[PDB]
Design a protein around this motif. Structure first.
Motif, mmCIF file in Angstrom:
data_model
loop_
_atom_site.group_PDB
_atom_site.id
_atom_site.type_symbol
_atom_site.label_atom_id
_atom_site.label_comp_id
_atom_site.label_asym_id
_atom_site.label_seq_id
_atom_site.Cartn_x
_atom_site.Cartn_y
_atom_site.Cartn_z
ATOM 1 N N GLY B 304 -23.281 49.524 12.980
ATOM 2 C CA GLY B 304 -23.196 49.543 11.545
ATOM 3 C C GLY B 304 -22.025 48.699 11.105
ATOM 4 O O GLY B 304 -21.242 48.215 11.928
ATOM 5 N N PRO B 305 -21.882 48.494 9.801
ATOM 6 C CA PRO B 305 -20.726 47.741 9.307
ATOM 7 C C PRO B 305 -19.439 48.497 9.577
ATOM 8 O O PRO B 305 -19.404 49.731 9.568
ATOM 9 C CB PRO B 305 -20.995 47.623 7.803
ATOM 10 N N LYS B 306 -18.373 47.746 9.838
ATOM 11 C CA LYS B 306 -17.055 48.356 9.958
ATOM 12 C C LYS B 306 -16.510 48.608 8.558
ATOM 13 O O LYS B 306 -16.427 47.681 7.744
ATOM 14 C CB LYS B 306 -16.101 47.474 10.762
ATOM 15 N N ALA B 307 -16.159 49.858 8.274
ATOM 16 C CA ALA B 307 -15.629 50.196 6.961
ATOM 17 C C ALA B 307 -14.329 49.447 6.699
ATOM 18 O O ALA B 307 -13.470 49.324 7.577
ATOM 19 C CB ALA B 307 -15.401 51.704 6.849
ATOM 20 N N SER B 308 -14.199 48.932 5.479
ATOM 21 C CA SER B 308 -13.006 48.207 5.072
ATOM 22 C C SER B 308 -12.921 48.243 3.556
ATOM 23 O O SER B 308 -13.894 47.911 2.873
ATOM 24 C CB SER B 308 -13.039 46.761 5.571
ATOM 25 N N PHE B 309 -11.768 48.656 3.042
ATOM 26 C CA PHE B 309 -11.476 48.625 1.616
ATOM 27 C C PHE B 309 -10.396 47.583 1.363
ATOM 28 O O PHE B 309 -9.409 47.519 2.101
ATOM 29 C CB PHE B 309 -11.018 49.996 1.115
ATOM 30 N N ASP B 310 -10.587 46.772 0.322
ATOM 31 C CA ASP B 310 -9.636 45.720 -0.014
ATOM 32 C C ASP B 310 -9.195 45.760 -1.477
ATOM 33 O O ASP B 310 -8.547 44.813 -1.940
ATOM 34 C CB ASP B 310 -10.227 44.343 0.321
ATOM 35 N N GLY B 311 -9.528 46.821 -2.215
ATOM 36 C CA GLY B 311 -9.065 47.011 -3.568
ATOM 37 C C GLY B 311 -7.961 48.052 -3.660
ATOM 38 O O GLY B 311 -7.393 48.487 -2.658
ATOM 39 N N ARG B 404 -21.180 56.671 -8.817
ATOM 40 C CA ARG B 404 -21.997 55.543 -8.380
ATOM 41 C C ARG B 404 -21.188 54.571 -7.535
ATOM 42 O O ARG B 404 -21.671 54.077 -6.511
ATOM 43 C CB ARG B 404 -22.599 54.828 -9.587
ATOM 44 N N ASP B 405 -19.951 54.284 -7.947
ATOM 45 C CA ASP B 405 -19.100 53.398 -7.162
ATOM 46 C C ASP B 405 -18.815 53.986 -5.787
ATOM 47 O O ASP B 405 -18.813 53.266 -4.780
ATOM 48 C CB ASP B 405 -17.799 53.122 -7.913
ATOM 49 N N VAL B 406 -18.584 55.296 -5.722
ATOM 50 C CA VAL B 406 -18.263 55.924 -4.448
ATOM 51 C C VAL B 406 -19.474 55.902 -3.524
ATOM 52 O O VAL B 406 -19.367 55.538 -2.347
ATOM 53 C CB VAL B 406 -17.739 57.351 -4.681
ATOM 54 N N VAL B 407 -20.645 56.270 -4.046
ATOM 55 C CA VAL B 407 -21.858 56.277 -3.231
ATOM 56 C C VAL B 407 -22.171 54.873 -2.732
ATOM 57 O O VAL B 407 -22.446 54.662 -1.545
ATOM 58 C CB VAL B 407 -23.038 56.864 -4.025
ATOM 59 N N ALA B 408 -22.135 53.894 -3.637
ATOM 60 C CA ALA B 408 -22.440 52.514 -3.268
ATOM 61 C C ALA B 408 -21.484 52.007 -2.197
ATOM 62 O O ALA B 408 -21.915 51.475 -1.167
ATOM 63 C CB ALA B 408 -22.386 51.615 -4.505
ATOM 64 N N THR B 409 -20.176 52.162 -2.429
ATOM 65 C CA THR B 409 -19.192 51.751 -1.433
ATOM 66 C C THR B 409 -19.410 52.474 -0.108
ATOM 67 O O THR B 409 -19.384 51.848 0.960
ATOM 68 C CB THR B 409 -17.780 52.009 -1.954
ATOM 69 N N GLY B 410 -19.639 53.788 -0.161
ATOM 70 C CA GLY B 410 -19.866 54.543 1.062
ATOM 71 C C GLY B 410 -21.069 54.049 1.842
ATOM 72 O O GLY B 410 -21.016 53.922 3.069
ATOM 73 N N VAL B 411 -22.166 53.748 1.141
ATOM 74 C CA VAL B 411 -23.356 53.234 1.815
ATOM 75 C C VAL B 411 -23.084 51.857 2.411
ATOM 76 O O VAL B 411 -23.445 51.584 3.563
ATOM 77 C CB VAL B 411 -24.552 53.206 0.844
ATOM 78 N N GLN B 412 -22.432 50.973 1.651
ATOM 79 C CA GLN B 412 -22.171 49.621 2.133
ATOM 80 C C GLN B 412 -21.188 49.589 3.297
ATOM 81 O O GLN B 412 -21.122 48.579 4.006
ATOM 82 C CB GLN B 412 -21.645 48.747 0.995
ATOM 83 N N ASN B 413 -20.427 50.661 3.510
ATOM 84 C CA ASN B 413 -19.444 50.710 4.580
ATOM 85 C C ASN B 413 -19.845 51.634 5.721
ATOM 86 O O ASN B 413 -19.047 51.836 6.644
ATOM 87 C CB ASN B 413 -18.080 51.128 4.023
#
Lengths: 466, 466
Positions: B304-311, B404-413
């Protein structure tokens, strides 16, 4: 004067099965409690080998022994009342086949009791609708194996034949195994239709597609790996017009009916400890569609984002397609995991490869995708999860990007994607070596002294946390 | 000489409950069939009004009439065996109070059965853990309304008191309504822990926060509207070092279980037709956490994608907080919608506002949150969904963007958020005046001829789709 097999219940599916059995050269006796529908079958069957009977005594005495009786009455009281009225007139070794969509626990109850009178009971799931019942259904018979083998030639002759000549019927297992397998089939069917409907929601509400561009998209999808009966009829549905030449499906009230059996699959999965997230969300999705008046009210009080997609529409349609195919994999992986567990706790010895085999044709979920499920268990009868099969593992590791984009796009645009959402959450939970359930465990030890285990040490531990 | 109330079953909760009752100045007789647990409590009760007995005959003869007996034994057959062995020894009008974690349907059977012999039976749900039972638990008693009034003095004395002085005990309703309400309490508890666990996973896997920063975040959240007992202990849990100064919560094996009691809430929701997606997926989340060694194998073959936050992390932390609150609203809206439907179906006349009132203290799900549920029903007793309550309405339409932002970010990561996902999906389904269930209806009519209704014309329709 004796005939080879008997059918009780001459409504459209009992009638269509009897004609199917007759189409293959077997002599059939028929009986309906209300004799006026037997009188229509004789007229609708002039020339065939249908011997009508007008009493349960004439019916039972018309059949060769060991008697083969197919019950096609309605479930519950009428089935048990038909069995009970039949039992005094039967002999040792005779065979009853309940063909209705019976809850499998009723079959287990009926099999156990009838076995004490030396009557064989086969609970047989039948899928394919009324056209399938007439030309070739998928049959899921469970009960006494010896009883099955005495009627196996009839079952094999009438069942659908897959592309490799294999008849879409096999001995499922003991007692209620057949009706259990039929119920799980419907649960899968709930998810397949929900995922198709989520695809339609994205196409209609996010890509602004018309019913003919929707129809053509599904026809295109039916030409590749996603080829299924359900996608095939979805393409036909978006082409049907009403009087005003507008798409008929847009005139339909969006209240999904359900006659049970879908809820039974999740109720059993919860009892078994099987995470059936996708089928269960599709059951709940039907529930919330049925409270239409409540939804109409909340739409005038609850705000949400406008649906606005500004990227490439064709490239996003391909992502929905990949997302639909991967959601199918995860749902079937959940569904087949339920069947291994039910096999284990009931000692049914289910051969999961044989279930995919008999679902390649005849049933409603029939699809080329099911051949790949059979190929998975053929290559590996110990396969613990479909997500680990090399073919499926190869699909999901690539398609997960399209699925993640679809879910995130629907979530940000206010389009509900419950089947897509739980799919990607199942894939991410099943592949996660470490889950946040350690916090749940520590909480339960905090407020309940329920103890916990460790990752590095062995044994049971209990902590005073404060 | 003779005692005011009796307790059968001297495990820690019945024992702590007996001490609670005696602490308020009441005389208590105690019985355990295994006499060793009675002897241990005898020594631990130095100077207390605790009179031990060692036979059910002696036990019943040591209580004043109408007798008040509290059953704190094992749920299931041990409860029925004790009730059976008590029935001949009782006098008409005596009161049995089953206080275990019992299936409400067993309580309905016992109440209806004991009423034929003129014995009152109260199925009472008890929440608070072993320490809560000693000091002040939440009590959910159901049964004969006048039999509750004869024991109401004792229950009010031992129950936890909200800070407005009110005791967290009230007459819930007839027969098994008390055990039903306790069962739904637990399902809500499952969703509260899973949503806290999903926030933790987001903080750790996506934001890379340490246990110090995770602990401080929950304590800050406990200082606001999220003030809750579960959030309070979570901040403590992340401060607990092991022997080598390491966060002990991280050493705990992430297996929650497959045989909890919250699954009964989902099974009941599935039979009532109530969409309980958030609690049900919280139950499913515990299932897949239980197959640890299978998950470890999948983590080595599925990518899966490696989780990463940059904001900005503090801005996202606040979005997690809003997503947690909104999801609790959505979870409780479903749970309280379940009870409203069960109260109609079982003719219980539940007063859901009084229910939230007795959950403000004593139980595990206690929070400032429950005062707003109480306010919602006091403001509008016929409230159909908490999402429509003006206070909760104002929160969700504001907080949906963070969810929505949390769900979307969580799915994308690749961070699984089954509780967050089904919350936003439930909000988007419930507010959707038009759902894609119209295609499901069209398909069911295509292959099954199940007929359909139309948005425009009235009546029932069937179509030859091709």
């Amino acid at each position: 004067m004796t005939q080879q097999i008997g059918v009780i219940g001459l409504a459209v599916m009992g009638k269509n099965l009897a004609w199917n059995i007759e189409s293959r050269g077997y002599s059939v006796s028929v009986f309906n409690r209300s004799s006026e529908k037997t009188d229509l079958m004789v007229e609708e069957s002039k020339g065939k080998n249908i011997h009508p009977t007008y009493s349960l005594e004439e019916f039972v005495n018309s059949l060769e022994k060991p008697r083969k009786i197919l019950l096609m009455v309605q479930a519950g009281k009428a089935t048990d009342a038909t069995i009970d009225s039949l039992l005094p007139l039967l002999d040792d070794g005779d065979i009853l086949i309940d063909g209705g969509n019976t809850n499998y626990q009723d079959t287990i109850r009926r099999n156990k009791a009838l076995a004490q009178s030396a009557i064989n009971f086969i609970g047989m799931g039948v899928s394919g609708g009324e056209i399938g019942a007439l030309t070739g259904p998928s049959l899921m018979p469970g009960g006494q194996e010896e009883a099955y083998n005495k009627v196996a030639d009839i079952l094999d002759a009438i069942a659908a034949k897959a592309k490799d000549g294999a008849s879409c019927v096999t001995y499922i297992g003991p007692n209620g195994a057949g009706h259990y397998v039929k119920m799980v089939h419907n649960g899968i069917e709930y998810a397949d239709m929900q995922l198709i409907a989520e695809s339609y929601a994205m196409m209609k509400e996010l890509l602004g597609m018309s019913h003919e561009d929707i129809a053509q998209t599904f026809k295109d999808w039916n030409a590749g790996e996603l080829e299924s009966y359900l996608i095939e009829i979805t393409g036909d549905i978006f082409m049907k017009l009403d009087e005003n030449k507008e798409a008929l499906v847009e005139k339909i009230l969006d209240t999904a009916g359900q006659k049970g059996t879908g809820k039974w699959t999740s109720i059993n999965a919860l009892e078994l400890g099987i995470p059936l997230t996708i089928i269960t969300e599709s059951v709940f999705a039907r529930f919330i569609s049925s409270i239409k008046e409540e939804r109409v009210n909340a739409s005038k009080e609850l705000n949400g984002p406008k649906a606005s997609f500004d990227g490439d529409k064709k490239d996003f349609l391909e992502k929905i397609r990949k997302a639909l195919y991967m959601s199918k994999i995860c749902s079937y992986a959940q569904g087949f995991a339920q069947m291994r567990k039910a096999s284990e706790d009931n000692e049914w010895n289910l051969k999961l490869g044989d279930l995919a085999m008999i679902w390649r044709e005849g049933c409603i979920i029939r699809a080329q995708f099911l051949q790949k499920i059979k190929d998975a268990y053929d290559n590996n009868p110990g396969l613990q999860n479909l997500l680990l099969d090399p073919y499926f593992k190869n699909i999901v590791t690539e398609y997960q990007d399209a699925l993640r984009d679809v879910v995130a796009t629907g979530v940000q645009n206010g389009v509900p994607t419950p089947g897509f959402s739980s799919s990607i959450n199942y894939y991410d939970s099943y592949r996660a070596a470490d889950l946040p359930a350690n916090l749940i465990q520590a909480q339960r030890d905090y407020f309940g002294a329920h103890t916990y285990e460790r990752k590095d040490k062995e044994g049971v531990f209990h902590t005073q946390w404060i």
